[PDB]
Design an enzyme around this catalytic site. Sequence first.
Site, PDB file in Angstrom:
ATOM      1  N   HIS H 201       0.811  -1.210   0.000  1.00  0.00           N
ATOM      2  CA  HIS H 201       0.000   0.000   0.000  1.00  0.00           C
ATOM      3  C   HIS H 201       0.846   1.262   0.000  1.00  0.00           C
ATOM      4  O   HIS H 201       0.367   2.306  -0.450  1.00  0.00           O
ATOM      5  CB  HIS H 201      -0.950   0.006   1.194  1.00  0.00           C
ATOM      6  CG  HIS H 201      -2.024  -1.030   1.108  1.00  0.00           C
ATOM      7  ND1 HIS H 201      -2.304  -1.711  -0.056  1.00  0.00           N
ATOM      8  CD2 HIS H 201      -2.882  -1.507   2.039  1.00  0.00           C
ATOM      9  CE1 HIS H 201      -3.289  -2.563   0.161  1.00  0.00           C
ATOM     10  NE2 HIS H 201      -3.659  -2.458   1.424  1.00  0.00           N
ATOM     11  N   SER H 205      -0.171  -0.722  -6.379  1.00  0.00           N
ATOM     12  CA  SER H 205      -0.344  -2.010  -7.032  1.00  0.00           C
ATOM     13  C   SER H 205       0.083  -1.937  -8.493  1.00  0.00           C
ATOM     14  O   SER H 205       0.318  -0.866  -9.053  1.00  0.00           O
ATOM     15  CB  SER H 205      -1.794  -2.479  -6.923  1.00  0.00           C
ATOM     16  OG  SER H 205      -2.237  -2.442  -5.580  1.00  0.00           O
ATOM     17  N   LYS H 227     -15.398  -8.605  -6.825  1.00  0.00           N
ATOM     18  CA  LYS H 227     -14.529  -9.524  -7.559  1.00  0.00           C
ATOM     19  C   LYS H 227     -13.850 -10.520  -6.623  1.00  0.00           C
ATOM     20  O   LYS H 227     -13.725 -11.707  -6.950  1.00  0.00           O
ATOM     21  CB  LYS H 227     -13.490  -8.737  -8.352  1.00  0.00           C
ATOM     22  CG  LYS H 227     -13.150  -9.370  -9.678  1.00  0.00           C
ATOM     23  CD  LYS H 227     -12.199  -8.518 -10.485  1.00  0.00           C
ATOM     24  CE  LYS H 227     -11.959  -9.137 -11.844  1.00  0.00           C
ATOM     25  NZ  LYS H 227     -10.704  -8.643 -12.457  1.00  0.00           N
ATOM     26  N   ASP H 228     -13.438 -10.061  -5.442  1.00  0.00           N
ATOM     27  CA  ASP H 228     -12.846 -10.937  -4.442  1.00  0.00           C
ATOM     28  C   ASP H 228     -13.866 -11.901  -3.860  1.00  0.00           C
ATOM     29  O   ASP H 228     -13.516 -13.041  -3.559  1.00  0.00           O
ATOM     30  CB  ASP H 228     -12.217 -10.083  -3.347  1.00  0.00           C
ATOM     31  CG  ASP H 228     -10.890  -9.490  -3.767  1.00  0.00           C
ATOM     32  OD1 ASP H 228     -10.049  -9.226  -2.893  1.00  0.00           O
ATOM     33  OD2 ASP H 228     -10.674  -9.326  -4.985  1.00  0.00           O
ATOM     34  N   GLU H 271       5.049 -34.282   0.209  1.00  0.00           N
ATOM     35  CA  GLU H 271       3.827 -33.799  -0.411  1.00  0.00           C
ATOM     36  C   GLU H 271       4.138 -33.126  -1.747  1.00  0.00           C
ATOM     37  O   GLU H 271       5.284 -32.768  -2.033  1.00  0.00           O
ATOM     38  CB  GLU H 271       3.110 -32.840   0.529  1.00  0.00           C
ATOM     39  CG  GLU H 271       2.081 -33.512   1.411  1.00  0.00           C
ATOM     40  CD  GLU H 271       1.247 -34.528   0.658  1.00  0.00           C
ATOM     41  OE1 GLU H 271       0.400 -34.106  -0.155  1.00  0.00           O
ATOM     42  OE2 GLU H 271       1.433 -35.744   0.879  1.00  0.00           O
TER      43      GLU H 271
HETATM   44  C1  HEM Z   1       1.652 -16.050   2.586  1.00  0.00           C
HETATM   45  C2  HEM Z   1       1.061 -15.947   1.402  1.00  0.00           C
HETATM   46  C3  HEM Z   1       0.856 -14.633   0.775  1.00  0.00           C
HETATM   47  C4  HEM Z   1      -0.148 -13.772   1.051  1.00  0.00           C
HETATM   48  C5  HEM Z   1      -1.250 -13.952   2.057  1.00  0.00           C
HETATM   49  C6  HEM Z   1       0.034 -12.653   0.218  1.00  0.00           C
HETATM   50  C7  HEM Z   1      -0.870 -11.603   0.273  1.00  0.00           C
HETATM   51  C8  HEM Z   1      -0.902 -10.673  -0.734  1.00  0.00           C
HETATM   52  C9  HEM Z   1      -1.935  -9.760  -0.966  1.00  0.00           C
HETATM   53  C10 HEM Z   1      -3.201  -9.671  -0.160  1.00  0.00           C
HETATM   54  C11 HEM Z   1      -1.574  -9.011  -2.038  1.00  0.00           C
HETATM   55  C12 HEM Z   1      -2.377  -7.908  -2.661  1.00  0.00           C
HETATM   56  C13 HEM Z   1      -3.394  -8.500  -3.643  1.00  0.00           C
HETATM   57  C14 HEM Z   1      -2.741  -9.096  -4.863  1.00  0.00           C
HETATM   58  O1  HEM Z   1      -2.015  -8.425  -5.550  1.00  0.00           O
HETATM   59  O2  HEM Z   1      -2.968 -10.372  -5.200  1.00  0.00           O
HETATM   60  C15 HEM Z   1      -0.310  -9.451  -2.476  1.00  0.00           C
HETATM   61  C16 HEM Z   1       0.381  -8.902  -3.534  1.00  0.00           C
HETATM   62  C17 HEM Z   1       1.700  -9.209  -3.829  1.00  0.00           C
HETATM   63  N1  HEM Z   1       2.430 -10.185  -3.305  1.00  0.00           N
HETATM   64 FE1  HEM Z   1       1.792 -11.454  -1.899  1.00  0.00          FE
HETATM   65  N2  HEM Z   1       1.117 -12.798  -0.556  1.00  0.00           N
HETATM   66  C18 HEM Z   1       1.670 -13.986  -0.281  1.00  0.00           C
HETATM   67  C19 HEM Z   1       2.789 -14.576  -0.854  1.00  0.00           C
HETATM   68  C20 HEM Z   1       3.637 -13.856  -1.670  1.00  0.00           C
HETATM   69  C21 HEM Z   1       4.866 -14.306  -2.128  1.00  0.00           C
HETATM   70  C22 HEM Z   1       5.429 -15.660  -1.802  1.00  0.00           C
HETATM   71  C23 HEM Z   1       5.404 -13.299  -2.911  1.00  0.00           C
HETATM   72  C24 HEM Z   1       6.707 -13.297  -3.591  1.00  0.00           C
HETATM   73  C25 HEM Z   1       6.985 -14.119  -4.590  1.00  0.00           C
HETATM   74  C26 HEM Z   1       4.473 -12.231  -2.925  1.00  0.00           C
HETATM   75  C27 HEM Z   1       4.682 -11.050  -3.597  1.00  0.00           C
HETATM   76  C28 HEM Z   1       3.633 -10.178  -3.861  1.00  0.00           C
HETATM   77  C29 HEM Z   1       3.711  -9.092  -4.835  1.00  0.00           C
HETATM   78  C30 HEM Z   1       4.911  -8.749  -5.673  1.00  0.00           C
HETATM   79  C31 HEM Z   1       2.506  -8.491  -4.823  1.00  0.00           C
HETATM   80  C32 HEM Z   1       2.077  -7.307  -5.646  1.00  0.00           C
HETATM   81  C33 HEM Z   1       1.626  -7.733  -7.036  1.00  0.00           C
HETATM   82  C34 HEM Z   1       0.926  -6.574  -7.677  1.00  0.00           C
HETATM   83  O3  HEM Z   1       0.851  -5.409  -7.027  1.00  0.00           O
HETATM   84  O4  HEM Z   1       0.430  -6.690  -8.771  1.00  0.00           O
HETATM   85  N3  HEM Z   1       3.399 -12.608  -2.160  1.00  0.00           N
HETATM   86  N4  HEM Z   1       0.079 -10.472  -1.653  1.00  0.00           N
END
Ligand code: HEM
Lengths: 101, 68, 72, 49, 60, 240, 52, 380, 108, 54
Positions: H201, H205, H227-228, H271
């Site tokens: 934030h 995004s 959408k969510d 797994e």
């Molecule tokens: C524990 C599991 C994870 C949760 C709960 C989580 C949660 C979120 C949420 C809520 C968002 C914002 C909504 C979205 O863009 O889909 C997000 C975006 C993002 N997450 Fe995660 N995430 C997780 C794992 C990861 C991992 C493993 C990575 C790295 C590879 C990552 C990198 C990112 C990035 C780069 C964004 C921004 C993408 C964009 O703005 O288009 N996340 N994540």
Amino acid sequence: SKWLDGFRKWYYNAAGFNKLGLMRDDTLHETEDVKEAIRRLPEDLYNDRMFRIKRALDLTMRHQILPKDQWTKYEEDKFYLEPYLKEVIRERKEREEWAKK
Amino acid sequence: EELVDPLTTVREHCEQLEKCVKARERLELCDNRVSSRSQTEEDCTEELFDFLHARDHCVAHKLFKNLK
Amino acid sequence: EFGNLARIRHVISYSLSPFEQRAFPSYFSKGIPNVLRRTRERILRVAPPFVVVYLIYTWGNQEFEQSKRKNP
Amino acid sequence: SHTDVKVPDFSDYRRAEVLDSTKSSKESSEARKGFSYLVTATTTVGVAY
Amino acid sequence: SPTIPSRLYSLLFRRTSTFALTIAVGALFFERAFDQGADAIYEHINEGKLWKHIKHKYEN
Amino acid sequence: SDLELHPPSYPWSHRGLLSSLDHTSIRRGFQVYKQVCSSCHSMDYVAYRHLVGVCYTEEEAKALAEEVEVQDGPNDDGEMFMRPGKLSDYFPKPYPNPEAARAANNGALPPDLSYIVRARHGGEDYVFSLLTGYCEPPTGVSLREGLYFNPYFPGQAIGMAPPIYTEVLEYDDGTPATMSQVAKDVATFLRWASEPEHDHRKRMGLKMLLMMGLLLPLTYAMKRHKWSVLKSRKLAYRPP
Amino acid sequence: MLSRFLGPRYRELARNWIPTAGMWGTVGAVGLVWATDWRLILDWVPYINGKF
Amino acid sequence: MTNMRKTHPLFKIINHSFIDLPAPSNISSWWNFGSLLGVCLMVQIITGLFLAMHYTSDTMTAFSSVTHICRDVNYGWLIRYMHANGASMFFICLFLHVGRGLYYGSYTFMETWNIGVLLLFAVMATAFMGYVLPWGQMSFWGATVITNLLSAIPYIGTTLVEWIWGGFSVDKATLTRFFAFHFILPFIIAALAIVHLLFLHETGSNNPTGLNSDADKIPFHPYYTIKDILGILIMFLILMTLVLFFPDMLGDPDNYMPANPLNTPPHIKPEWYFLFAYAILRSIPNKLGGVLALILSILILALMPFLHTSKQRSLMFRPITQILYWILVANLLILTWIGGQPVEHPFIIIGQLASISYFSIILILMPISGIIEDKMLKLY
Amino acid sequence: TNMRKTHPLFKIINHSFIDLPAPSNISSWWNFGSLLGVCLMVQIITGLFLAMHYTSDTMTAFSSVTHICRDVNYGWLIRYMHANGASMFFICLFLHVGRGLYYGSYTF
Amino acid sequence: WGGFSVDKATLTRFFAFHFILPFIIAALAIVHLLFLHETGSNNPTGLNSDADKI
Ligand code: HEM
Ligand SMILES: CCCCCCCCCCCCCCCCCC(=O)OC[C@H](COP(=O)(O)OCCN)OC(=O)CCCCCCCCCCCCCCCCC
Ligand code: HEC
Ligand code: HEM
Ligand code: HEM
Ligand code: HEM
């Protein structure tokens, strides 16, 4: 040769930002040099670029592209950002080589 | 005896098809080749598996209709 | 934060009420060609690696099965 | 000119009861709101169940 | 005549409290109808196999 | 050998997506387990109270558990004693410990058949193929005494004697007691014994499928109705 | 892509920061052998060899 | 009179993050997976909370407590298979989340990407010890294999593995501390996800075009809320059909046997969401090299922001790198298949080829393809 | 330039603990509030090290606690600081509420 | 109780609740501090300490 020109315009069609009405310089990632070159643009080029970006965002929101007679073509893709960007990297390289010594 | 297993009937109906009889022919060539007693340790589990695989596919098509 | 994100001039936008318009306006008749167009644009980048690894999977399974067999 | 602009044609998108331009509204607005809120109420009932 | 969605909007869907009351009463009637219908589909697809179909030979 | 036999897929009555178990077959397979399989195998996670509402009534299962003779105690005098079984009594182990089970059954340990359809690939197809697949060994292979040739057991040398044949028990519903019928009934019972929720699971799956088929297009219509402002939006650009 | 720091000024900064970084590394090594009670170095020291 | 949405402090926080958050208008269905990961995390907390009300971490009474949950607790089978298939759905959502980040250039949000990498490490550790918890044959033997593999680092491997075990093998101390660690770890995951959302934030995004989306931005409510909701209900459809109709296809059957330290299974595989990394640790006939290769596979996923050489962010306009990306995706698929296979001909050579191709695509081929595309667009 | 005011994670710590304006005349009673937080962390940490050996079963709970005291290395220390840290937590909590009542802190 | 009286189900669910409640306590303490920091601490005199703060 002209083979390379034809292959570049085939790649221009295959990349696909021409279908959204975009220029090549619109697709540049907004780094600091790119953002400074945007800041040095005249207001009509700025407004044209922002409208092109907004229209491409609207079209990708609808998962649609333009009709073919308003696609961008390889010939009239004007390179508006090239002299501003060239001057920005020349100035930054000059500042860097000054600060190195 | 007086009450006959239907699985044997479906089995003997399913050992007369083409794939199962050629698997069986390879099975008796394996049997008399090993039983020729050349003093070498090969066995006949693979063509037995082939014959059993074809026969059990055939009887798995048509076994459960006769069981209550 | 809204109100100080960008400088936009000379852009007009027109919309409708969600109660004033159809939910699914020409759904199939404009959706089947557009899905076909997206498929035409993306199969030559997506599909052939998956086809190649399908052939790798089938070849590996049949080579494992042939290595199971006793060599006469 | 501010008088040179006009809203483009939305006849591909608007509903059949609001397609006729020479017929006034507030005759079918209750039906449209009832249909959309009926969809909302039925999916709320399913989610509540 | 006024339509069925028109009467539904003017009588039930206009306010929010009547909307919530309609949702609650519809949820009651709908869980009754849905549970009975889905259960009846379940013994129509599985006739003679469930315990309720065969608790006549041994229940006495 | 290193070769593996893969048992086929028999058309079970509970093979379908919404298909239930034949509870008369579960009752008959419990009769098979009580008469045959409980001399050597245990059922250490199934009690007698699980048979009510599934195969027997409560008086029938109470009478079945009454014939059971269970260790309990210690009493007021401070020692073990013996009682008739209750409904809350689990199925009796034939042996007090796995070492006596290995001793009585010629080395090999007869396993607990409480998850045996969920602990074998192929499920009850494997159980049906193993019980009905006892054949003579082929040419060349030497079968040791105490071992029997079953091609579906891995290694093809099982320590289990063929436990079923034609008319090994008399059913109480006038069923022909063929070996295939007994094997199919005990396979259905063993499938029930590792998942007693199976009928309830498929009923919930039916309700979930109907509910979700109702809920997908309506919440899709809610999303599409709310996004129709943006999807019909038209832009314009008029520089001066 | 680390070609921005190829000059005499960054070399001057480097030879300024050799002794401080070396002393911080000495602090880290002494703290690591102190906290871990490592037997390689603590047998080479006179007074701490009392519990062994 | 004021507005309680924008003046009350926690209402101000949720208004900043969920209601009046300026989101791009053109983000596709791949952007639903972060919320899917969050709601699947919440499902894991709730279902595990109800599972731990009857579980007893003790080697004499763990398998029996699991069967008591399955057969005596009302709907205990439902909550247990919801937990297991929710772990599987969680890793599906993680893989598609990281694939979205890799394709659309979202790794240039560097601190968000690194906080994500830490989240991924924590989730993989948590699910590993959770799979250890039911104390089946496969749980005990997979734990044994993973920790003896960890014992190969020099001069501290044996000490660290006997400290992790609480003894000289896997026993009841390991089971109790694994229950404690499995219970605690998702709350650290939740806190790190809060930090993840904080960094995102602040940085905004990303859109599928990779362009500056501040020209056209829409509020989060009601658009991405509905959408969510649609995505969450689709994920519940997939999760519940895989619980109620196919409850035992993503696990292995010989986890339904009690743990035996004497008997060992012939196919000791973890797994499915570990299997590709398993193939990497069998791609080298050296244990230290395999452990190092696994951890630096996840670390080159962390190092991915430094390898970006193109002047375009997303792969929307870059078809050569698109082809390389899908070659990498199919390579991950066959890495999973090879990890699900025994060490036999011809799986050693195929696994070695898959590993060297994966590392060559991530390290070498993608920045060279970016340079080639920039040359082909007359950039340089 | 500085990370204390511009980095989004260090900005929270600076706003809450470093450049936070506090009254210059608050007595020792206010320290009790921070003490409560410390007790919470202490309890949580010690609780985790009780959870690596505790067995929640009516047959083996008392026995597991005795095994913690008698066989686990320094396990008696962790168990008794968990118990007396619960007591110290309630002491600090009571004095925190008494500070709230006396100095009119309930108007927040 | 999960049954007629206090038994093993009560002990296990009390273990789960006793483990998980300090994390809701920690989050509520975060909200406690957040609600405090909008207005600042109180002083023993009760007066406005904005004339002299450190
Ligand atoms: C524990 C599991 C994870 C949760 C709960 C989580 C949660 C979120 C949420 C809520 C968002 C914002 C909504 C979205 O863009 O889909 C997000 C975006 C993002 N997450 Fe995660 N995430 C997780 C794992 C990861 C991992 C493993 C990575 C790295 C590879 C990552 C990198 C990112 C990035 C780069 C964004 C921004 C993408 C964009 O703005 O288009 N996340 N994540
Ligand atoms: C030569 C011309 C292009 C191909 C023929 C198509 C001609 C179409 C002409 C008419 C135009 C129709 C509409 C065009 C739409 C957009 C353009 C398009 O689809 O192009 C084809 C596409 C991308 O082509 P492009 O990326 O430009 O080529 C690379 C240049 N260096 O896709 C391709 O080029 C196909 C790429 C196939 C890649 C196969 C990879 C095989 C190996 C995968 C291994 C994976 C597993 C590895 C495992 C390792 C361990 C064992
Ligand atoms: C005493 C003669 C037994 C009778 C009666 C039944 N079984 Fe048995 N079984 C017995 C032994 C000694 C073993 C161990 C075999 C070995 O090689 O170790 C078994 C094994 C099984 C198995 C397990 C097979 C596997 O692949 O693990 C099954 C599924 C099995 N037996 C089934 C079974 C059934 C259904 C029975 C009732 C008809 C039954 N057995 C009776 C000994 C004995
Ligand atoms: C803090 C919340 C959590 C708690 C309390 C919890 C608790 C438990 C318990 C008690 C078990 C044993 C029950 C069983 O195995 O049948 C278990 C198993 C498991 N958990 Fe969790 N868990 C939590 C979060 C997670 C998360 C976030 C994941 C990963 C997505 C996960 C993955 C697993 C897996 C894979 C199993 C093994 C399932 C099986 O084989 O039966 N858990 N968990
Ligand atoms: C869970 C235990 C608690 C913790 C961890 C906690 C934590 C804190 C912290 C860190 C502060 C700021 C430091 C300070 O001013 O002392 C504080 C202040 C405060 N707390 Fe708590 N607290 C707890 C219990 C309570 C309770 C039970 C009450 C209500 C009776 C309460 C009411 C207050 C008030 C009113 C203040 C403001 C102090 C002032 O300005 O005078 N706290 N607390
Ligand atoms: C998440 C953190 C916590 C965990 C995992 C935890 C865990 C445990 C465990 C396993 C026991 C039983 C072992 C024993 O009795 O020696 C226990 C006992 C106890 N805990 Fe906690 N606890 C936690 C936090 C707390 C907190 C915050 C309090 C204070 C309100 C507390 C108060 C107690 C008390 C009073 C006992 C009984 C001590 C006794 O045996 O007399 N615990 N805790």
